[PDB]
From TrEMBL, chain C:
Binding site for Ca(2+) 2: 16, 19, 22, 24
Compartment(s) where it occurs, according to its Swiss-Prot or TrEMBL record: Cell membrane
Family from the record: Belongs to the potassium channel family. Calcium-activated (TC 1.A.1.3) subfamily. Slo sub-subfamily.
Protein name, UniProt field: BK channel
Residues of the full protein shown: 884 to 1065 of 1070
Length: 323, 189, 174
């Protein structure tokens, strides 16, 4: 059920033909509330390392029924290489073919989805500077335009920052404007690779920064795993003792809305300070920041507001739970 | 080329854009752009569709590829005395090109065959099609069931645009018995 | 030898090399050359010239596609975009009524009811007799070279003679 460390969920060494599907088998399976990964690659392309996407989704913090199943869409000859890492994870579903065929998407059901990721893996920054993410930009537009009996969660890997211009319809922004102030980067529909170069500075100045980041991101990437993965045997199984299984009780990032629940009393016209104290005492919950609607379905971000700050009913809050 | 259109249409939405593609299937990616409107002047010229398309029509009826190529493109009419009979008459054909304009009130409540007789005999012009109202649509040489309404766009082939004006300036009572067709250019019927 | 042929040519000046009886200068322009009149040749460079026509006349590119493809509707573009391909189905009587439309075709004046004009008639008499009785529209002629290549004439005058061994471009409705 779990790893040797007891931090992630585990499965036996499956072959690729178990988790493979056709369009009919994907549609026949009643998939809802799941992750989709639009993977652009050739057979003879470099490895991204999709393990690092799936691994944090399959943390021991979440129960077996709570885990969001992933549906990768891309080329086979690529994924045959990466299968040796991915084989030991529960609830995968590799579909062949390109993610521009709408039949592949409509079978997978982006209609009912939690998050549709788009990742490139081709030889970029070689020929042109601006026409790099043309496949990533077309794919996002394709899904937004596609309709069925628009409001879709999306996120795109972009090499070049200025290509963020092309994504949204309502661009009320100048070309000279800097990346972080742009609309989609506030909403979280975009994400740059250039952020990783800026982390080099932070690791130099604050010594205990890079540690804090990894603990929030990966779920529970201990140094034990680095030594175990170095051996070459892979993710070792074992159902573990009660002492090791106690380690799963740790924090996780999650989002809470103020439409229903006991915190909905504050949503009519309360304040952030009253929400903070009532959350921490009774429940044992820590709030980081808000995630509002744009006007009165894009949603901008607020990281740690003041005490005297109003709260609408249709708001969402970033939270660190302990259960 | 699709990405280029995106940047152009991002900078200014209400702009006329025309594109060359290679494969036919890529036309769909232009429809995914929200500001793209074929109603308001935007077009897409497929190579493969038109390249093999001209060749395809030649299989059905030979030499149609040349008829069409010479029809729509611009060609210089210049009959020199060195040329033979067959070369001179060919040159006359190449000069004839596509032109569109509204019809007069005389064509109202008539059929397409009955319309074209008046065009060919009196006015000395050819008709291909009429823009039929409905979301309007084009229709090449329709049957006698369909009739003409007010202010319908005609589709002509002729020597020049100046001669097509004779379609607009016309009347049954006034412009009846006229020998020389160049005389017909009267507004006050 | 007497075979119908047609060739895709990238370069225009390569048209020189095709025919035997080249009574033409190398400096002569493409459209005036023998084989491009006969329809044995075809250039890809014609597609670049269509870019101009689409700019000036707005309802030009539409007219071309309707003549060429037969019936390429915008419905097909959306259906082919899905990835499933050409969907079957035998259809209702309402949808099958759409097949009754025009098509390009060629008619000769050797046999048939129009052969009366072929002995020594005129193009104007052919035009009116075709349109009234049959419901046929003639575009242009396709003659023999002399008295088996065949040059093209797009929309001649009224007073124009017609030989017996002639051929005419036609838009039928059946």
């Amino acid at each position: 059920k779990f790893d040797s460390t007891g931090m992630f969920h585990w499965c036996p060494d499956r072959p690729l033909n178990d988790c493979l599907q056709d369009r009919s088998q994907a549609s026949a399976s009643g998939l809802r509330n799941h992750v989709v990964v639009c993977l652009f690659a050739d057979a003879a392309s470099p490895l991204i390392g999709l393990r690092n996407l799936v691994m944090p989704l399959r943390a021991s913090n979440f129960h077996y029924h709570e885990l969001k199943p992933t549906i990768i869409v891309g080329n086979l000859d690529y994924l045959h290489r990466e299968w040796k890492t991915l084989q030991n994870f529960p609830k995968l579903s590799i579909l062949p073919g390109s993610p521009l065929n709408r039949a592949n998407l409509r079978a997978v059901n982006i209609n009912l989805c939690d998050m549709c990721v788009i990742v490139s893996a081709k030889d970029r920054n070689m020929e042109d500077p601006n026409l790099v993410d043309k496949e990533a930009i077309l794919c996002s537009l394709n899904i937004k335009a596609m309709t069925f009996d628009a409001n879709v969660p999306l996120i795109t890997e972009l090499a070049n920052d200025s290509n963020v211009q092309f994504l949204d319809q309502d661009d009320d922004d100048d070309p000279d404007t800097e990346l972080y102030m742009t609309q989609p980067f506030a909403c979280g529909t975009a994400f740059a690779v250039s952020v990783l170069d800026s982390l080099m500075s932070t690791s130099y100045f604050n010594d205990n920064a890079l540690t804090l980041i990894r603990t929030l991101i990966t779920g529970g990437a201990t140094p034990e795993l680095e030594q175990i993965l170095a051996e070459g045997a892979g993710m070792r199984g074992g159902y573990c003792s009660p002492a090791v299984l106690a380690n799963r009780d740790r924090c996780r990032v999650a989002q809470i809305s103020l439409f229903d629940g006991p915190l909905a009393q504050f949503g009519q016209g309360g304040h952030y300070g009253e929400l903070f104290v009532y959350a921490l005492r009774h429940f044992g919950i820590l709030c980081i920041g808000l995630y509002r609607f744009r006007d009165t379905s894009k949603r901008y971000v607020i990281t740690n507001p003041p005490e005297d700050f109003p709260l609408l009913p249709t708001d969402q809050v970033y939270v660190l739970t302990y259960k | 080329n699709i990405m280029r259109v995106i940047s152009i249409k991002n900078y200014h939405s209400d702009i006329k854009v025309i594109v060359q593609l290679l494969q036919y299937h890529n036309k769909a990616y232009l429809l995914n752009i929200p500001s793209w409107d074929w109603k308001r002047g935007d077009d897409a010229v497929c190579v493969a569709e038109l390249k093999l398309g001209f060749i395809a029509q030649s299989c059905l009826a030979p030499g149609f590829s040349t008829l069409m190529a010479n029809l729509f493109t611009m060609r210089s009419y210049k009959p020199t005395p060195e040329m033979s009979q067959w070369q001179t008459d060919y040159m006359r054909g190449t000069g004839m090109e596509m032109y569109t304009e509204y019809l007069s009130s005389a064509f109202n409540a008539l059929t397409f065959p009955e319309a074209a007789e008046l065009c060919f005999s009196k006015l000395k012009l050819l008709l291909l099609a009429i823009e039929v109202r409905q979301e309007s649509t084009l229709a090449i040489n329709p049957g006698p069931k369909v009739k003409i309404e007010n202010a319908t766009q005609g589709f002509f082939i002729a020597e020049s645009a100046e001669e097509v004006k004779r379609a607009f300036y016309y009347c049954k009572n006034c412009h009846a018995n006229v020998s020389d067709v160049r005389q017909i250019k009267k507004c006050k019927c």
